[PDB]
Amino acid sequence: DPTQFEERHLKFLQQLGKGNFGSVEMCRYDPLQDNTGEVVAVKKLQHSTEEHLRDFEREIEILKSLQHDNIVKYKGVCYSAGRRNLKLIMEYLPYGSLRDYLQKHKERIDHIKLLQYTSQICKGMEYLGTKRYIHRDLATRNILVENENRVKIGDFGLTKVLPQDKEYYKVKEPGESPIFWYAPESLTESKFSVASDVWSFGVVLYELFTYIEKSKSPPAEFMRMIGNDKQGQSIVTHLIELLKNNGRLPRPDGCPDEIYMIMTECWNNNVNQRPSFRDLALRVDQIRDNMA
Ligand SMILES: COc1cc(-c2ccc(O)cc2)cc2cnc(Nc3cnn(C)c3)nc12
Numbered sequence: 001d002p003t004q005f006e007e008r009h010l011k012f013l014q015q016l017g018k019g020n021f022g023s024v025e026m027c028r029y030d031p032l033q034d035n036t037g038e039v040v041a042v043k044k045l046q047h048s049t050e051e052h053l054r055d056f057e058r059e060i061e062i063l064k065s066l067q068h069d070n071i072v073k074y075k076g077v078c079y080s081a082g083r084r085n086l087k088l089i090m091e092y093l094p095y096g097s098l099r100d101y102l103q104k105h106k107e108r109i110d111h112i113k114l115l116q117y118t119s120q121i122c123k124g125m126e127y128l129g130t131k132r133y134i135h136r137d138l139a140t141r142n143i144l145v146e147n148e149n150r151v152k153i154g155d156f157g158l159t160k161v162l163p164q165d166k167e168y169y170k171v172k173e174p175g176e177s178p179i180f181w182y183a184p185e186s187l188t189e190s191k192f193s194v195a196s197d198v199w200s201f202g203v204v205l206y207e208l209f210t211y212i213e214k215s216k217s218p219p220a221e222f223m224r225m226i227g228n229d230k231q232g233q234s235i236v237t238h239l240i241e242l243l244k245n246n247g248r249l250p251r252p253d254g255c256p257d258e259i260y261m262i263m264t265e266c267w268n269n270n271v272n273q274r275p276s277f278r279d280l281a282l283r284v285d286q287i288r289d290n291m292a
Helices: 050-065 098-108 111-130 184-189 194-210 218-226 233-244 257-266 277-291
Strands: 010-018 022-029 038-045 074-079 086-091 143-147 150-153
Touching (some): 050 086, 098 143, 194 277
Antiparallel strands (some): 010 022, 038 086
């Protein structure tokens, strides 16, 4: 009954985000037509092909199986008659993405606060790992802000389930890929694992401590390091060679030494040497404790 949402009762309120394959809208589920209904986040496909609907149904099952304080809450699904188009209903987190929230308030969010968000992201990621899911798209644009004290991981659109017998998932024909957040083995061999999500987490830590200063973004900085003249496939070729030669994002201005050390450990070329999310949450909570 409650996880079953009638499409005719969903009132469009505003556009929240546009993705690779779909979009997120803020809607009011109002089966009384008196504007007293619940506000929800609705994800739908812009191009609802057979393949996209199959991947979207997988994302829906992934989200429904996760129950953690730092993972967006699944609410339900809408089904259309005939071709069976799907809408994913979720809780609406009113402060928007962490990227936009941090870009808006900048240094008004102190290091203690950025570390509280860091800890929350590690715990969400650690929990994800227990289900053998690989996020593949961890970035501040995919983290949502519930309120000043809580962030949650969103956009499971690229998420993969590890096979029973392997610790990595190989993507045979990649679609749009966030290469500036990718581990070297993800760029070279299209292999994704808990360890490549740890690499991404290091880029998220970098994002947080740059306060989303446009000129300092991972695409602007990697582009500067490989040369702005690089285009299309040549960018991937030069990024791989850069990472292999220990080219890395710089320390963000005013970033504490203990935090920058964590980023650099996440960015190890040796997959086995990268820290675990269980250890990261422990280390971050110790740093917050020392800071307090
Ligand atoms: C892209 O935005 C969102 C994405 C998802 C999402 C999508 C797919 C998925 O598997 C899991 C979560 C959920 C969202 C929930 N609440 C908001 N709120 C918001 C956004 N902007 N502003 C101003 C308030 N945004 C959300």
